[PDB]
Design a protein around this ligand. Sequence first.
Ligand code: GNP
Ligand code: MG
Length: 426
Amino acid sequence: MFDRYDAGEQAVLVHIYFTQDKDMEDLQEFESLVSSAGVEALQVITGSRKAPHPKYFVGEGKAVEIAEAVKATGASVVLFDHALSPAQERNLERLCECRVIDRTGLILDIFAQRARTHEGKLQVELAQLRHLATRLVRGWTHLERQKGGIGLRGPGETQLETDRRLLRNRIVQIQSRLERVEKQREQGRQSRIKADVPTVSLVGYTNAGKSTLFNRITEARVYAADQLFATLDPTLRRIDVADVGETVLADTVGFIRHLPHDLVAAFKATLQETRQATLLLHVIDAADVRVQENIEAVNTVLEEIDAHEIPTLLVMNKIDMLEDFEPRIDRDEENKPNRVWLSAQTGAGIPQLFQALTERLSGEVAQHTLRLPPQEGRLRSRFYQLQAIEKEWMEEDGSVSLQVRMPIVDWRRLCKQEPALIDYLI
RNA sequence: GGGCGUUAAGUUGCAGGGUAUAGACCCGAAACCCGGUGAUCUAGCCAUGGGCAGGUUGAAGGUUGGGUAACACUAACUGGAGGACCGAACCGACUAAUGUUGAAAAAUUAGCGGAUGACUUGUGGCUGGGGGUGAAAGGCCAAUCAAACCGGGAGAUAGCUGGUUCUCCCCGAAAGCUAUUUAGGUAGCGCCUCGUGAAUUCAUCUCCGGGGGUAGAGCACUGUUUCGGCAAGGGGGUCAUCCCGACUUACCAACCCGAUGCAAACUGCGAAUACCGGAGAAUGUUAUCACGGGAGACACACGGCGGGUGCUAACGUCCGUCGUGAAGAGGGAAACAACCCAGACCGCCAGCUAAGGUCCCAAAGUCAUGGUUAAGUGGGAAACGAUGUGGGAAGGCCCAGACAGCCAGGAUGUUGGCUUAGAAGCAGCCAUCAUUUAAAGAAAGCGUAAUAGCUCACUGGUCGAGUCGGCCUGCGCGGAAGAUGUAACGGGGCUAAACCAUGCACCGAAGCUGCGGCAGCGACGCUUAUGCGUUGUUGGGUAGGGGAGCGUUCUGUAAGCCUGCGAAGGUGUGCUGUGAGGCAUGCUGGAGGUAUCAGAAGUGCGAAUGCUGACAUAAGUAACGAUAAAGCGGGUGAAAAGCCC
RNA sequence: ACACAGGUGGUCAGGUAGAGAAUACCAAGGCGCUUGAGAGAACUCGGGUGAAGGAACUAGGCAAAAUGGUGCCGUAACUUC
RNA sequence: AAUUCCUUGUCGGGUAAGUUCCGACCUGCACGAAUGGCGUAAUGAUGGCCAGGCUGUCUCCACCCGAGACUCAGUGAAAUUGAACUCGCUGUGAAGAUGCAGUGUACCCGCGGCAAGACGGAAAGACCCCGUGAACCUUUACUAUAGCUUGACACUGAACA
RNA sequence: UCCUCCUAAAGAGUAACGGAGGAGCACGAAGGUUGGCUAAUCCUGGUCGGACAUCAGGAGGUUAGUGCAAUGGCAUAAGCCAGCUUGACUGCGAGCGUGACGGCGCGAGCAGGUGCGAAAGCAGGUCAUAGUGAUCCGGUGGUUCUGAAUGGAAGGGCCAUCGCUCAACGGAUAAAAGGUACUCCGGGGAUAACAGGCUGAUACCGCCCAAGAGUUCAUAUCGACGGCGGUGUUUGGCACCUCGAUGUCGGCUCAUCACAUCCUGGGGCUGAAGUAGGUCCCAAGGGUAUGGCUGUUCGCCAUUUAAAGUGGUACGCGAGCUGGGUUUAGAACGUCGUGAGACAGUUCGGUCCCUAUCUGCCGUGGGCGCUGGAGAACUGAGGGGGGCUGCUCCUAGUACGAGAGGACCGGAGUGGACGCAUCACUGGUGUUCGGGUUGUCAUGCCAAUGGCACUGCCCGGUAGCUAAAUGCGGAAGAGAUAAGUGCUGAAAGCAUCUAAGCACGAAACUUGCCCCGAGAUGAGUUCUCCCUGACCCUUUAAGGGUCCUGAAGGAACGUUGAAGACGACGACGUUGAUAGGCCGGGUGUGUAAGCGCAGCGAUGCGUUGAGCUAACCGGUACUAAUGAACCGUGAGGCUUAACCU
Ligand SMILES: Nc1nc2c(ncn2[C@@H]2O[C@H](COP(=O)(O)OP(=O)(O)NP(=O)(O)O)[C@@H](O)[C@H]2O)c(=O)[nH]1
Ligand SMILES: [Mg+2]
């Protein structure tokens, strides 16, 4: 059952930050959820100061209120922030008329309205599938009432347990198709076997400007806007680097607090690039007070997806609003998990980003000042051919001095192929 | 006036068609209720007697002292308690397994609980059916218990299931509408049948006299639509004198203009066919309608057409409308109710045809001629792919010689400027001209770090007729994988035995045709119940209606007649009719059977898980009753594993 | 329903070993259970023994294997003592 | 949790492996005090679970001993059956073919062995539905009444006041 | 229930849990009548006045207007205003419409009195259809109609009218709730639950288009939005098949096919350094995880292996088992119910029947066949089994690669699983082989020996037999092939793997190995061996009969077997080793008996490796296997030409 719940309708919204201990979503970020969802917003019903209930999630009275609010203002749907167990939705339904949805199914709905690549399709509908598989379970009741209550002769196994197995088969089927996929992108990753494989990946919330930095650094077409899901689909484009020249890039989708469980499980394919990635570049916003939290938000999922062992590089993007500083190097240490001073739409901070990077990935800077007598056209050749002369200075009788800095694999492919009696490089 | 009437042959039999009340054809329910029988099984209770081996624990208590004023404390010693243990007798059933047509309508074997107690048992007693009983389960109440057994109102009713017996000729349904405590029922009418009546009653064909709003078509309207319009109002705008306001709308969107379609519930149009009245001919047994006597039938399926629905599915449902089936046999599509052809009164070792076929199974063309197919297409299929091959129109090039290959040239500006280590025909970038010449691009591909080679585009020459395509089009390939065995022509097998067209022969059904019978039916003549005579015509059939019968048994008829020199009964035998049947005669029989025409019926059986009586069948199989075994010598004895010693 | 493996009350209690009216073996006393004989196949029944391993089997240690006795030694949580 | 749906919730203990279990945890889908709650000595032919032991349970089974199976003799059964000359493959078809089609194979006839089929036997589907079938209970279905409750009047008199 | 529109097929009429919708009244005027008026919407102008009120002027032609659904209706308006009015009367109805009926609709004219207009003439409810109830039993009112001895009266009818959501609307009655798991009765495939059957929306597999990513790149690999197919497995519908019974999930024995490929096998490309992969193609030969957890299939987890392939097969397999889940009665919890009661909410407990006729299956038989008869040896017509593979070194640290890392092929080894076969080894096993010993019994007693107690308990072991033991086995090479790679080579001057014609090419194909195998009804080969007698009548492919012959060979019985269920199949039957014996050896138990002698004794010491000894090896005619008899024969059918006479 790949079915979609629509985004873009009138809704009684109910939310309660006002729970007292877990807390979460001041509302406004949830409103953004609502926004990029395209929901027809109506009103913001809100309850009080409660621990969550075995009842109707929130309190009795407030529940009755949202019910009436629906019945009067005519909301197309009771949107209801913060997740619940299915029966909770059930009892809530008894007091209403319309579809209810937790934070989850919202996020899936919008997610699916965003799907464009077939990969995104499968992992989405997968997350949709695993999610709905739970919730269906109480719904036997009607189906049972029409069934007669005894007379299961033939089958031993009960129905709907049947349906349970159905959706299990769906599940395995979906992932089954997912298999050849991760294998696919992996065949793309065999190229990551070549020893010369820089491999960055970006991370942050949605509207962490990820699209933007990616833009300016790439001179490539990746659209960016206020909305959540401002990007979907990993996106490869190569870039320059002072010490490995080629340098593969691939943008990740932006994050939120408490992104869905099964989402990730479906989403491991897409992030499968992140894991291997040799460096976790991480943009962060500079306008929100949300700062810390978002990092704490991001760290969350990073944990569950491994490779949080990776060296990282923070970029306090959006320095424009703040005039935090002139863009700068910001050695957290000689180690450099550095903060970096950006405003990506201006992107004024870049050169320090690249330079700091230039410090952060290498392993052989013993430079050499190479030289030859009229036999260097081939040298200049190799140097432009592969990476870089650091400096080209011709001199007397065709004797010509140079400086070059390459990673060692070059040094030996060169020392081998060329006579290299020129012998400045090893 | 209008309604009924005015009107104008009935009644008693008798045979019979119904229909009414009764068991109304027979078989069959769960229960309902009344009168009776039980407590020997068990449940409970009552009196009265019995049963409970062996072992072990040790309360209370007692006795003696520590101990302390004493108490507490406490020694032992005895003392013998108890829904107590351990385990036989007796009780009881937890686990396995056999056995489950078993040895036994709950046993068997091995393991288990109680076992001096709310125990167990002898023997008698009392409680009874809507009642008893209940350590209560809805369990027991003679193995039967959510209300016993057993006799009677009892043929309880049964709108369901079953089945309902001899023969020919005639006719032929329906599976619908309305209503239905109705949906598998039944009733009124539709349809069949019979009997009576009467319009030339009707049906086809034509001709005339009609009506119309679907198909189609169409865009005013109805709503929809696309794009130009067009102005267009307008939130802007616009500007500025602040603004008089001008101006701008360059967005905005009507209204109307032009052209585009779209429609079950839009229509300024509007067919066929049907419907409907008149007219006429021929043709059909008045085919019509009215009436009276009887029905069943009320659930239809598929096919062609018109639809709804569905998924423009289903052997799907639901209507329309029509065909076969049902209730129709033949032939063909291999096998085929629902397709094509054709409605079997019966015979005939005659004939011709139908659809459909004709190299063999296998009936007939190895038919004629013309054209295509290269695949076994035929003999399973698409979007789609392509120097497959047939066909076609037209178009391009060319004997001033093209097309293919082949001889050679490939140019100067100028390595274009920019880029840059280097770019320059080929890192780019943008310019990319001008020249020469038949010829050559600042460039189509390779190459170089880059530079410089390498090939065509370009052409001369060469060579000598055709050459390059798009379009249309028949017929073919690619796409194209299934379950147990070739299995997607019936097979053999095909290269014509495929396929396209034309023609001739022939096969091929019960249809038709000749020959021969039989039967209705009308018919006019004949004739009178007559008979005929002639002729036309007809004769597949379940529900169901109608006509004729066959046969048994009794009664009349018979004190007839048949029979002992063989009646009835069995089993032969031939003779005979359209038939059920008769008739003849050998075998047994050893006693009775009934022409003829009447009379009446328990009157005709293959079926009901019919019912009794005889006998098949598994099979000469499984088994023969506890796995506590016998061996022997002698005895009688028709015989000795059994018995006698 | 039977010469059926079921049930049926009360009396009697020999030895030898052992607590014993169990078991073990015999007294007195009955009994060889009304079809056999041959043969030594699967399979079933009822059993006897296993190398290695030791519950991996299996719904589940089901079955089966596995402990017994006498005396002396010593005997936890917890205990309503 | 004998309570939970969700749910193999979370948590750690036990396991190489933990849908059970054990103990916490507390968003108790939908615990709660006589409709008794919380504990607990001992008690269980009680529910779940672990460890020691042994073990043909098994991994895989092997021979031995018994009684049936076999043959021989005597006896002498049943269940069931439209009729038998009662092959496969593949079609076909009241839609799962021994019986048709076309095709393939195959002397005549027992014995013991195996149980896929012969929609094999056994009993009128208990499931499901139908029927103006029945029974039994149920309660604020109706409609009746027993027992019960009020009141009259009679057996019922007397006086006063 | 009733009304309008579509479905509806140009008339009616026509259905669906098909498409839209209205209705249970309103009015004494919204009615009778004559007299007059005629629409919305639109432009200009104009006080508040405005987009939009009122007024003028035009425009325009009912797009307005109908008491409300809708559709047809509508200018002589029906719509509108106003006067007059009760025709919203009264008894009658030519004759029509649609109804099965009940019943419903229109109707002129007339009778009797109205009412309007001058008159013509207009009025028996409204523009039209929707606006509602039969029956009974009663009420109110009238009543020139009855009234039970007569006179009244009560009562009834006659006529007027009233009493209903009887709305499940043709209305079972004044009066009408649930539960069954305790179950029941008669039916049903006329309708569910299982499975098939049909179909493929769904699911599932390809296929086209190429938006894109895939570091540049659309097509190594992915493929967006979209399309056509295929499979007939998943979920569904469809209810034709079964309810006079087809047993249902999981496991457990057991396989069987497909190929839509899990490995191994062969190839194309690669984003193929090699290592490896990824896809694609070709391939069905074989092979393809034990455990934990839960009834599970799954799924998850731990560790493996080359691989842990898919799916079909009544979701293969209950007349083979299993009975944990599934669904009964017991009970409990939460929860819903006032309840009895239920719940797919969970927990406890809970009976698997069939001795095999047919089929087909596995063995193994007897009859007859094969042209006189045997006896042994055959050939191969056909059939089956057989098919896995790791891991190590050698090639060689080589080709590869900067390194790391590490090959191709060839060859050597050495295993897992599986199959085949023998006991010699290792053992297993051993109820007949020996010894130990508790209980007791008996043997007169005695130390001595037997009986019983699971074989009494135990101890080892021959033989037989068996894996756990041990050898052997799956090829090689040919033949013809796939996919692919080729040569040459034209049709088309060039091309070109193809048209011609050669070269390749794999666990698959056919052989190559083993087993089977003339019932191979085509009934075959070679070799051996045997019978070569007379007479009689009938029909003469023919005998028949006499008589006389009986052969090789067959058996029949018996001795027995490593042969065997029985059969069969061996070995032997006195010219003999087949058995049992018997003799020896061998074999294991472990040194006996009796006696001797140290010890009071239990016992011992020496007599002594003792005796004891199967299933065995070597030996031996002691017993048994005797001989007649019995089956079978007596010389071999015609044709046909060959060669010989
Ligand atoms: N002031 C400011 N605005 C910024 C900055 N970076 C991005 N933005 C704006 O914030 C929005 C970020 O869009 P986006 O890049 O898509 O955010 P994202 O984090 O990439 N989301 P996603 O990864 O889903 O695309 C855009 O409007 C972007 O221009 C920044 O550094 N400063
Ligand atoms: Mg981004």
